[model samples]
Target: DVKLHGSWVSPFNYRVIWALKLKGVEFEHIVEDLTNKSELLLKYNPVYKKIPVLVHGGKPIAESLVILEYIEETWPENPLLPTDPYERAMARFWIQYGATKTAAFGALFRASGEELEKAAKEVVEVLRVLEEQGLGDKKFFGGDSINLVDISFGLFTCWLEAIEEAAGVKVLEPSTLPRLHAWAQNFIEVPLIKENIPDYDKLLLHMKGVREKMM
Candidate 1:
């Protein structure tokens, strides 16, 4: 049996969710209230004490990226990674790059004045790398269909917009990062993701609170 303990608003949770759904794997979605976490959640992920704990059989797997690998390996129905080892290694590189860039992306919500400009540029630089070097001319990060790499950066579709709205900044402009901007639109259009994504208005409201807290 497969089970996932995660929160509704977390993009990390959605990473696992999209991976499982794309692989056509069914699992129990155990929603966790982060403010009042469940004992089982803590038990499953003692080290991090974070949501997105994937339990297969009786063994628990913490961390969203780790869970994604586990899902791809355990259920090889819809392959998310490339077949070639070298290609797979390249894919992992971009995935890790996106994973490590959370701080730069998060800074956009809290920063202001010159700091806001720097934050936006930092985000744009990262996006530029992914756009020119990572994505290039690929339809999706994984070519025609979305893959683990695409999933890693999928937060841009929903969360990025909310963060931008709340912070009153526009970094993901089509004029500047046209390919990345277009990719975001294409990502959300996929049926599986489109159907399962969180409500935009609620996410915006939540991000508004986040910006208010930091600013």
Candidate 2:
């Protein structure tokens, strides 16, 4: 058995959860409130002091993507990464891309008209690369099946829409990003994914509250 130290609303935490669930590896879950973190989290990942520290067989792994690799390598049952060397490299590329690409979206809700315009265009460029170079015309990033790449972008399945609505800047229009639009629906509807997402209305309201503070 394994142990995952994380929280529900943290997308990074869910990234680890999705990988573990996809690999069919059952684990103990320790939901940590970001406000009152445990000493164990500090002990495990002192550098970042973050949640989503996966403790397996008494060994702890920090960083969501690193923990994801640890779980996939340990299980090797569901096989999130591809067997082919080049494809496996591509999977890694997209995972890193997802991690890097969301920085602009992270700042969009607090931005003004001109700054928001710049952020929105940055977002479009990010999604355009994802749709064309990364996702292409595929139903999912991992072809017909859901894999780490799909899980990596899982937060956007629902979270992006709420952010766009709250911020009033849309990056995933159907006319411009039909494939990504369709892909988002497909990713959200995946069995495990569908069950685990937070309520849409609640998430939107939560974003609005956060944006209020930013203003």
Candidate 3:
């Protein structure tokens, strides 16, 4: 049996859950507290001691993307990575880019004054590239179906509302980014995607509290 140790409010944790669900894999989900991590989480991933440690059989895998790759490889039914070598490589390239933007998102929400403006611009540019160069005319980053790339950027669909509200920045607007905006909507409409997300109001309140604490 597969088991995932994660948190209710973590986007990274959401990635793993969505991936596993896409592959139709059954796994136990154990929510974790950062300040009060369980024994298994501590022992499984002591290096980072983070949520989203996937335990398969008796072995443990740490990190969300790594676990995603593992799940794709293990199942092989619903392929997240493309079969063509270059296409798979391109997907990986986009995935890495999106993951780094997640860091920019954190900095944008945490900055103030000139730094805030700078970070905000950085975040916008990343979204623009994602829209123009990355998403283009495709319904998803994965073309017809949701792929690992879509999963990588999925947080920006629903969770982004909380981030944008808390920061008062409309980063995912339709006018500025029509493709990505539409992609977000289509991305969440997937049965597995919609089913696994956290409650919007709940995540909004949590993000508000987090933003308030930052102030």
Candidate 4:
């Protein structure tokens, strides 16, 4: 059996969970308290010492992106990534882009004054790139179906909205990035994504608490 060690609130963890659910993988979830690290987590990912580690058979893999790829390869039935070399390359490209841009998007919490403005601008630029280049007019990153790229950026649909609500900032306004705005709506409407999402009200409260502590 496969095991996943993660915290519920972590978007990274949710990414792995979504991938597993999409591929119909049965797994056990071990929710780890960040304050008290589990011995298994330490053993599995001694270098990074982070959660969302996937344990399959007797082997362990760290990093959500790596775990995601592993899931797709192992299952190969309900593929999250494309089999075509070019399409797979594009999927990986957007995944990396999302990783790089997440820093700026996350800076909304820690940024203030000129720094906050700059971060906001950078976030918008990144979102625009995803809308125009990655998603374009497709219903999803993988046309009609959700794919790795879409799952990689899935946090924007819910968690980012919570952050925006908590911080009283509007980074994903429809008027500003209409395509991305619509994409967010389309993404969450997918049955798997919609059903598996955390409670919206609970998430908003959680975000408010986190922002209060951060600010």
Candidate that would win on lDDT: 1
- What tens digits encode model 1's per-residue C-alpha lDDT throughout 1-215? 99999877889999999998998888999999888999999899999999899999979999999999989998987899999999999999999998888778878867788899889988988899989999999889999999999999999789998998888888888999999999999999999999888899998998898888887
Residue-wise C-alpha lDDT for candidate 4, range 62-177, written one tens digit per residue: 99999999998899998788788998999999999999878777688887777877877788888999899999989899788998899999999899999887776778889999
Error of 4 at 66 (Å): 0.3
lDDT of each: 0.90, 0.85, 0.87, 0.89
Query: Candidate 3's C-alpha lDDT?
Result: 0.87
| Superior by TM-score: candidate 2 or candidate 3 | 3
Instruction: Quote the lDDT for 94 in model 2.
Output: 85
Candidate 2 residues 100-148, lDDT tens each?
8777787787788888988888887888888999999788998999888
Model 4 ranges off by over 4 Å: 113-118
TM-score, per-candidate, Cα-based: 0.97, 0.93, 0.95, 0.94
Residue 90 of model 4 has an lDDT of 90
Clashes per model (N, Cα, C within 3 A): 0, 0, 0, 0
The predictions' CA RMSDs to the true structure, in order, are: 1.0, 1.5, 1.4, 1.5
Candidate 4: minimum summed lDDT over ten consecutive residues — where?
112-121
Q: Assess the local accuracy of residue 156 in candidate 3 as a C-alpha lDDT between 0 and 100.
A: 88
